[PDB]
Amino acid sequence: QTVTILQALNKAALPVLESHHNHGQPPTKVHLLNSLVKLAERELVHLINWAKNVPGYTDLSLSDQVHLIECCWMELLLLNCAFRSIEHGGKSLAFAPDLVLDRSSWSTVEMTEIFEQVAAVSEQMMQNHLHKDELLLLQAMVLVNAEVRRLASYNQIFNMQQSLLDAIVDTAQKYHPDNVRHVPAVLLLLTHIRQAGERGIAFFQRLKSEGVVTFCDLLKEMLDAQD
Amino acid sequence: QTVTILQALNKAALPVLESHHNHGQPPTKVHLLNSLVKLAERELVHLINWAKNVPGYTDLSLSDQVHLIECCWMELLLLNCAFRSIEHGGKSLAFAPDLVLDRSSWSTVEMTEIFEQVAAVSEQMMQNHLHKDELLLLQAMVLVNAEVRRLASYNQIFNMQQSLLDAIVDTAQKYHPDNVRHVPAVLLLLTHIRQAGERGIAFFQRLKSEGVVTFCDLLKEMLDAQ
């Protein structure tokens, strides 16, 4: 049920990670990005562990479990960050409590178009009074909506999508009763997260290629899963 | 209300255009792309014209009107092509009646990734038994959701989103009564259209830059907006 899904997603809630960024050295492009890149990798390991808790997911084929993650990992990172950043009303993005970056920083690391979209999404979440339970459902949704093409596990993914859709609708009724515009408006945010994700991955691929910023192999395999 | 919005969106909504593609010549990459490219410029003219019928739009600043189209034109094209192709159930894309492309062709023009995503979306529309009125609302929604950053006409764009959101919910009740999953599942298709749109625009810019396939001025400028 909606209730069972939510309990599951909630006892698997991602913890918040510190960046342990060294603020003792000034924020060069390289300095910030190495913290951002590896904050990403730690949150990445967590997502993977978290995904296996999304009800139905461990019943997909291994290849498709990996595939879903390969499609949407960056979206999940950005989606989370947006929610972490809800209090800043679009003024900054909180990648970690340890690492809040404003538009100024975004320019330094040359990820302005990306973070400007995310930050705006953050503001929309704030404006739509999004509850944690709704966000939990949203990430699960981002995951199961990762690939639109037909996979071997098509059936099971369909079943998960249907269950998630019901849970989102019921959860919206709980925290925002009789508001028919809410779920659609919030789902519309996902289109921006998707756009941000795509640009995100493209940027990280070119970071990888510039070889200055160091990637560990987990993040690096994710990048090489595209092209 | 829902109805008056719907009457408006219907006015000058994209028609079927023939590409007048010449099948007498081999379906090379260049030959196909010249048809797709010229088909695109013609549909773009329709889009520009259609947009002005989306209620509220002509009240946006001129600047924001241009910006919205610049953001989402490609998504609008693919969304339409998906809806034109709904009968082919994901097997091929009917860019025009005279220009229907299956998976084999997509390879020739090296747009496999894009069209596979569009074709899959098409199958989803078919499976959700999507009605035209719904597609009309979807197009308008694609347009007014184009940019999430704050524009000068933020206030008015927001009003437009709200009224469209109402009309979408009512139109869903009419054609798919009491189905709580219909609207959400359908809106989720928009994320895939966005990804394909983004890839489309990239593909076309690299086409423009390799100077072999020829772009008109309308198309060349939309591309130079990114």
Author numbering:
A (entry chain B): 248 to 474
B (entry chain A): 248 to 473
Give sentences copied directly from the paper behind this entry.
In vertebrates and some invertebrates, members of the SR gene family are hormone-activated transcription factors, which regulate developmental, reproductive, and physiological processes. In the active conformation, AF-H packs against the body of the protein, contributing to the assembly of a new surface that attracts coactivator proteins that alter chromatin or otherwise potentiate transcription of nearby target genes. In contrast to vertebrate SRs, mollusks contain a single SR ortholog that is unique in being a ligand-independent constitutive transcriptional activator.
To understand the mechanisms by which constitutive activity evolved in the Crassostrea gigas ER (CgER), we used X-ray crystallography to determine the three-dimensional structure of its LBD at a resolution of 2.6 Å in the absence of any added ligands. The domain is in the classic active conformation, and the backbone conformation is similar to that of the human ERα (1.36 Å RMSD for all atoms). Unlike other SRs previously studied, there is no electron density of a ligand in the interior of the CgER LBD. Rather, the internal cavity where ligand binds in other steroid receptors is occupied in CgER by several bulky hydrophobic side-chains, including F425 and F525, and – to a lesser extent – F524 (using human ERα numbering to facilitate comparison). These hydrophobic residues would strongly clash with estradiol as it is oriented in the human ERα LBD. The resulting cavity has a total volume (168±8 Å3) much smaller than that of human ERα (402 Å3) and too small to accommodate estradiol (245 Å3) and other steroids. First, it indicates that CgER is an authentically ligand-independent transcriptional activator, which exists in the active conformation in the absence of ligand or other apparent modifications. Examination of the CgER structure suggests that the historical substitutions confer constitutive activity not by filling the ligand cavity per se but by stabilizing the active conformation in the absence of ligand enough to remove allosteric control. Replacing leu with the much bulkier Phe fills this cavity and acts as a sort of linchpin that improves packing of these helices against each other, presumably stabilizing the active conformation and providing a structural explanation for this mutation's potentiating effect on activation by the receptor.
